[PDB]
Amino acid sequence: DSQIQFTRHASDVLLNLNRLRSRDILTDVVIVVSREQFRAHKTVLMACSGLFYSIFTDQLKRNLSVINLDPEINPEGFNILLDFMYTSRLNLREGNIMAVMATAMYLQMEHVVDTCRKFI
Amino acid sequence: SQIQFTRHASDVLLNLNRLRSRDILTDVVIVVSREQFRAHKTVLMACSGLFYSIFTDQLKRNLSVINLDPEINPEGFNILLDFMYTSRLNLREGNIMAVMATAMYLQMEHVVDTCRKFI
């Protein structure tokens, strides 16, 4: 018997999921962060965030199509994390690292928080 | 500065497979000669040109049940579905032709090209 391990398969799947997101194909939720809105696939959000995982495994919240995050959450920080979920790349700047880290803590993304700590 | 998480995509895919096995947010059942396989349309579209076409077709994109061609082998489909969700393609001498035929039907040409190396 034989097993072939396609080493860029997962990356290729994730790129295609990001392309679906950019085209708004099969997205099933909007995340509202104060004045800004971001469409996504619940499966990707649950895969990456303990907060979204907990929301969408609640039987009474699984069908929510609109999520309003806490008013204190920074939209730019959320956008950076959403892009990370769909690309594997976390793009930080001196002016936004604190907001990214705070948003990652709120989203229960502990490994991203740990990375952010390294950049002050 | 950009931090590249080199195992992030694999970690996402594993979590998507865990959601599949727990039947969380799956939105379609694929029927192959009366055998049923639940899945996420997004993953099927990401991996297969046929499913990409089906799930954007205005006449089929809202169906929760998709019936494949009656000549499609259920074992071959299961092998390809597992590959979609894990990156691992398992081949045996007794099923490689069925796997290859199923990949051709699903418009997964890169998988077909790999199977050809083992013939």
Partner: peptide
Amino acid sequence: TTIKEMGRSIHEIPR
């Protein structure tokens, strides 16, 4: 500036 991180990036969903 690009920096590789090879550790787990996200939580692991249980079986």
